[PDB]
Design a protein around this ligand. Structure first.
Ligand SMILES: CCOC(=O)Nc1ccc(NCc2ccc(F)cc2)cc1N
Ligand SMILES: CCOC(=O)Nc1ccc(NCc2ccc(F)cc2)cc1N
Lengths: 354, 143, 354, 354, 354, 143, 143, 143
């Protein structure tokens, strides 16, 4: 079982950890559990139905704390998947993660109330869904795009601010007395923001057609300006994902290059005189004529990996025309090298016939 | 050397399981399992292919001794392996840290052991700063 | 007529089937028929005018069921256009399509009520317009773009969710007692969603200026966040269509390549010794010195198709600089080959004068 | 004056006609005239101020009809700028343009009422601003982008339609009796459209929290879907304008190529034996040893234009790397041609020393 | 201190002036000061809290005028950083900037009222935040994108205008008598604009289902059209920033080229005979065998800078394939030059053996 | 061979409808209709062009016999047809399925009959897995 | 020919206003105005430059006679002018209509007269369909 | 010249602080501070590298005299420096204004003094319009 012991720990934790296949299946579903738990937590917030609300909601609360307490422990052991952490030191060392500690804090509070907590109970389920991330790559991705677009965004934000301030103030002095709505500058600022975002509550508006003629321009500007940063950041994502697709072809290229050099040093360490190079010999003797056989084993695996890295990059539009460039150019070079050979034999028979 | 020839005949018979005079693919997978690895059959095929002079599907002792007598400076992959070094030195400045080397050698391709990557950096770091100049190391290994 | 019989079946079904010319003309118009039928089906839902509504609506219902029942049959026979389906087996075999079976199911229900069905009648006309697709390429195209943008979308969705939850809860505790509007957390959540989407019904809003100061920030964030995924997917389509335009030039290139190899094997099968290669001989003898003539017929058509594929790709910006690359590079190669010839004659007269 | 007569006609009509410099100045200003005329035409639609409204509005009406009647005539004569139209036939021939005829029709109606027409008066000023275009390039540009994006747009339109229909119908059966608002399916459809466009009038909404839970999802989908085609077409323009910028560099390249061949044939027609080539000789003799001088005149202008077209294209990123490609590649070719010369002299002295 | 005197003036003014590091830190914070001052200036506009509002607001007013008066002076002296301005003439010359003069004007008014000014006080704080720019690069960036997109924008603006006019007028004649809302064409135009921008105040709407059928189409068009220019300009920024990223790699290339030629002329001026070239000699003698040493100093710094500019451009996708182009092509050229040498020696021994 | 020469003269007179000694375009369209096809006149033109040595607009018996005596290995289109194979093997891995081959040969260009594509795959599939290695097949056909 | 030499000396003195033995730029602008055109001074400069063998700023009679004796087939711009033909045949298929030729020759560069463009198409259209094959026309003019 | 050799030995001993016969990096930083500059040690290294014939880490008097005897036309960087001129003439038309030259020479790289850039333009502007033709100036300096 120990073979399966480490197999399941490693592979199933990599699923549990950063996955690539179908780990989001489990993760989206446990998401659904805790999230729907939250929803029915709000379902208790309907007095007409809150009774049955709690009636099933405490059911779901039991389910939730069970799910994430066991997730705590099982992620612990499955983290035996990690080479650098195996046993006492490693897993009694890595537990001091802030994500982990807030995990156990909220979870022990969960079992405590699972041993009038409605509000903070909402907060802890909140922290569960927050726990979905573990990496902040959301914020990382965002701030990247933002800083990438910093001067554009500041442009929009500034000019929109000015339209808001100006037009609001103007109409405040446009319907100062004809409407109880617009009676303080605080009033108008509420109106300006509620308007320029195209929300349109309706609880205020101008009636003096002069004031209406004020808004009936500054709206045309501001509302679009407020609509910009959504549109900008939306594209900004789109552009980023396209170009990253292209580069993705290269990282595919990179891993075969990424491994061939491994076999390269695996070749160099194979000298019988290089007993100081005990790295691969101990790797083999631990994975254990035959030793020179093992030399040929690793070194020949290096040679085959050599052609492997030769195919590390397959295509890419500019790199693909790099390759077709390679075709015509290198075929030419083959031909020129031939002509080199021709001139070389002629240089040899220069003395041969003289 | 004659003793080299003898050790190579010894290893050949080691791969020469059935003793026919060549190393078929079956003995190759056999000896790989004996060493402990599960090489795919196409893998043993390409090993023969780059060892099989005649192209018969078996590694004769001729091909065996020729490989066993050839050195790394007898392989002709200088700029190739240098580009393959360049990948991990993404900056392409000639120095890749022992950090990146060690880490990726722990989680890429046939990742080696700690002493494997350790001797790798010790031979690839000769000046003593962890930053592994790679073109020097290919220059030192390829000659 | 049999020549016209199969001609009309084949070509007019390809119109009926996946078209490229003007089949959408007929298809949009029958769309208009069934759709306007639906509209007047709602027109029966105005009591002031529902009487005349049904008065003409049953007219349109007759028209609709006629149209699609005949479409069922005529698509059947026109599907004699299909080579793999010709007669008993083929057309008595392909009818088991789910699109086809739901077609006949809804249609036989249509003639049944065309022999108090208002609600499900609406449903079956619904299924007619659903029947417009036959391929789901709508959903296919969508999910492609979505999965392509998965991590971006999840970013937006998550952070928008958090703004919604937080700001709604806050203002609920910001105007807890000053407004009958905001009296349960269910209340606020209705308000949050109705607001952050910039709908602005108006039936709720904050009056305590402290609460207004709450919303007057979280709106500025959330409303844009909710506005993102529209903007993202809009571009995502735009980018996709541009790059697919470029590749379209290549598929134009690809079909001439796509056919020349046909004539290539058409050449190889032309050996008189290759009687085993009875493919083209039976193709000709079924389409029937003269047979060696037919050899030259197919084989020479192959040669002309050879230059045809030579022109398979005409231009493409990177491929076009590939071609101009070909011009200068290959002209150089012509020149180097000349110099090859020069060195070769010199290598020949090396012995000639020695 | 006749020199200035045709000069002013030609150049000032090209301003009046398709311009490139500062003709939009005049055109935007006459736009302002007629448009502000329209606005005050609405200003008559305020009974509190309509009296003074007409008081100045008829002022502006006089101005408008004056402006465009004179524009009719002056565009006529300035169209003497056109080579193909000069005098009786040409300008008594081109007047039959539909733009022109609707021009004179609306304008003669204008002077007729300028000799209770409020409504159609609005219509004719309308047709004036419509007259701003003369080319429909608005519609042309639009339909281009649309057809370019056809399948994307149909995707969005279809799926949005389905969300509208489904969610509206559902909530209609979700608050069928609890609200006088939602009392007919016509009611809901009004509500669905007013909502999914994020307009939010407020005059309807769900109160049964079950019905609110219906909308509180289908909104999240539909509103974004309805927001797509704006975002798509917005980018679609943006992408189009970028790529057209790049090609613009080439048309700059193209005109010098576009003229050099002119001088090319100008060279060929210069043979004294080519008296049949009376084109340039009559061009010169009409623009009038000296005739062979004129030969050298046109032919040498051709040669200088030859280097002119040599500089026809200056740069372009891919074309610019085409040029730097030209630098290294052609320098190589210069060097190879040298080596050609070397082998050629060696081939000559092969016999010289043998 | 004079060394530190000019050091702090120069570097800390470049921070104060166009920065690249962390000057926005100070600038955003002083922004926060003046801006929050503005906010509490509005805080005086709440009668319930205006008393304490002024109570702390005059605190902040003291802070603000202090901040920007000292900013005036300290920017003056720190502008001793500028080479062209050092002492009497320079700093008594540059002060006549319009930004500077409006600065001192508003600021002296500030200290004047800091020696019933609420409204214009708001205006002067306004001008402070306006003072944030100093360059108008906001407007510059905007107008660039606008003119870049001019014809697209005019397309959208025009067609949206037409939808607004037409649909508004129609519904005005669709519910002319059934609603007190729609009673003048001015009424409808207010409704059209409030609607097509998706604001949806709610204070007007159609009830005659015929009129509702009018709006229930022209909305579907217009609202998207009004939503376009936001989406267009949003992308327009995004595209601009991407392509400018690429070019940014080149300006990085450009500065090393930008300096090597400096050392180039620094070499040429080093001739002892070129005493007329007293530029560098006086630069050195002012920065002061040894003079020929200084020759080698500057000239050798030129040579090292020569290889520096050799590395001026490091990579760029097309330029990077330019470089890899350089690799294969130039390696080929090395090889061809070798073959040149071969033919040259053969041309030399042509006579040697003949 | 002389019998080859006789069969080629026989076929030439077959295309040599009017017996002038060359095959004009009209006889070519004629014989194509006799075989059953409607070749466009520019089509018969290019056939002459690639058969017409002199370029007279007719296929003389000289050009006839030269074509009839030449083989596929006498055509010089190796890498060309290999690229033309590569298109359908979009992955470019050397093997295109008999599936894609059969399907597209049923609905692209001059699509052949079932036995036509059948013999195509039988000669293009020689190992027996339907996956049609294409560069092997061009190598086998072009020699 | 000697009569060619005489006509060229005659035209040279025509441009040789001051009779110095070379044609300076001033006489060039002078004779251009005499013909009726206003050539910019840099324009007359480049004419000298491509006529001025020595590069003196004047067109000596040596340079005059050499230009006057040289033909269009003595100019070496075949593929250049062919690309310059290609621009207006945007499709690049070898045939540009007499329509596009005529229209753009009426509104591009030094647009010619009706008979100018007329003879242009008559020499550029030799088959009689208005569609002006351009590479044939450069081939005919350049030889 | 012998007096050139003497001045170069004099300057060498000036850099030859310790008098060993070569100019190590330490004397280079020393003499740079004596002149007033703070050159980084890698900077003095590259100076040696492009002066150090042997590559010893010091500038022997051999390398000293060879540099001191070599001229700018003995450096082989024509098209290089011309591209480096091209950057500031962004239009690439051969003429960069004395304005842009002066300004950027005041705020780029080792910006010089007013008379430094002044003599720069005076030698780089020889026709007298401020617009500094750059390829002429490299042609004049490099010969
Ligand atoms: C493409 C279909 O249309 C949209 O995806 N639109 C949309 C969808 C969600 C959100 N917010 C995140 C959220 C998601 C689910 C929830 F239950 C609560 C919040 C915003 C927008 N604009
Ligand atoms: C970039 C600043 O913000 C906007 O340009 N937005 C915007 C501007 C106009 C329109 N409609 C056309 C129109 C223009 C003027 C008029 F007087 C009447 C109609 C729609 C939008 N969305």
């Amino acid at each position: 079982r120990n073979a399966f012991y480490r197999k399941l720990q490693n592979f199933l934790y990599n699923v549990l950890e950063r996955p690539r296949g179908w780990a989001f299946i489990y993760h989206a579903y446990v998401f659904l559990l805790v999230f729907s738990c939250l929803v029915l937590s709000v379902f208790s917030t309907i007095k007409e139905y809150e009774k049955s609300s709690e009636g099933a909601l405490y059911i779901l609360e039991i389910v939730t704390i069970v799910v994430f307490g066991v997730e705590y422990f099982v992620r612990i052991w499955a983290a035996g998947c990690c080479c650098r952490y195996r046993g006492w030191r490693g897993r009694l060392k890595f537990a001091r993660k802030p994500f982990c500690v807030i995990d156990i804090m909220v979870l022990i509070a969960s079992i405590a109330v699972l041993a009038s907590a409605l509000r903070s109970l909402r907060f802890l389920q909140i922290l569960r869904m927050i726990r979905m991330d573990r990496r902040g790559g959301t914020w990382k991705l965002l701030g990247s795009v933002v800083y990438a677009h910093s001067k554009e965004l500041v442009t929009a934000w500034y000019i929109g601010f000015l339209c808001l301030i100006l037009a609001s103030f103007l109409v405040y002095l446009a319907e100062k007395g004809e409407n109880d709505h617009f009676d303080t500058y605080a009033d108008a600022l509420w109106w300006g923001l509620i308007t320029l975002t195209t929300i349109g509550y309706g609880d205020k508006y101008p009636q003096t057609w002069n004031g209406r003629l004020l808004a009936a321009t500054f709206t045309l500007i501001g509302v679009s300006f407020f609509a910009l940063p959504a549109g900008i950041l939306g594209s900004g994502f789109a552009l980023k994902v396209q170009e990253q697709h292209r580069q993705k072809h290269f990282e595919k290229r990179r891993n075969p290059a990424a491994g061939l050099i491994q076999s390269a040093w695996r070749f160099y360490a194979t000298n019988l005189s290089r007993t100081d190079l005990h790295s691969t010999w101990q790797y083999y003797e631990r994975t254990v004529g035959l030793k020179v056989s093992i030399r040929a084993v690793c070194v020949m695996r290096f040679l085959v990996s050599k052609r492997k890295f030769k195919e590390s990059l397959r295509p890419y539009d500019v790199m693909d025309v790099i390759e077709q460039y390679s075709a015509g150019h290198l075929d030419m070079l083959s031909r020129i090298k031939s002509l080199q050979s021709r001139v070389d034999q002629i240089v040899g028979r220069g003395p041969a016939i003289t | 050397t004659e003793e080299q020839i003898a050790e190579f005949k010894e290893a050949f018979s080691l791969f020469d399981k059935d003793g026919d005079g060549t190393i078929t693919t079956k003995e190759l997978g056999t000896v790989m399992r004996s060493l402990g690895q599960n090489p795919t059959e196409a893998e043993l095929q390409d090993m023969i292919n780059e060892v099989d002079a005649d192209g018969n599907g078996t590694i004769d002792f001729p091909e065996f001794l020729t490989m066993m007598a050839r050195k790394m400076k007898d392989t002709d992959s200088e700029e190739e392996i240098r580009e393959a070094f360049r990948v991990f030195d993404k900056d392409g400045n000639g120095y890749i840290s022992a950090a990146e080397l060690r880490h990726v050698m722990t989680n890429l391709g046939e990742k080696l052991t700690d002493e494997e990557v350790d001797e790798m950096i010790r031979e690839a770091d000769i000046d003593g700063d962890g930053q592994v100049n790679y073109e020097e190391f290919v220059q030192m290994m390829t000659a």
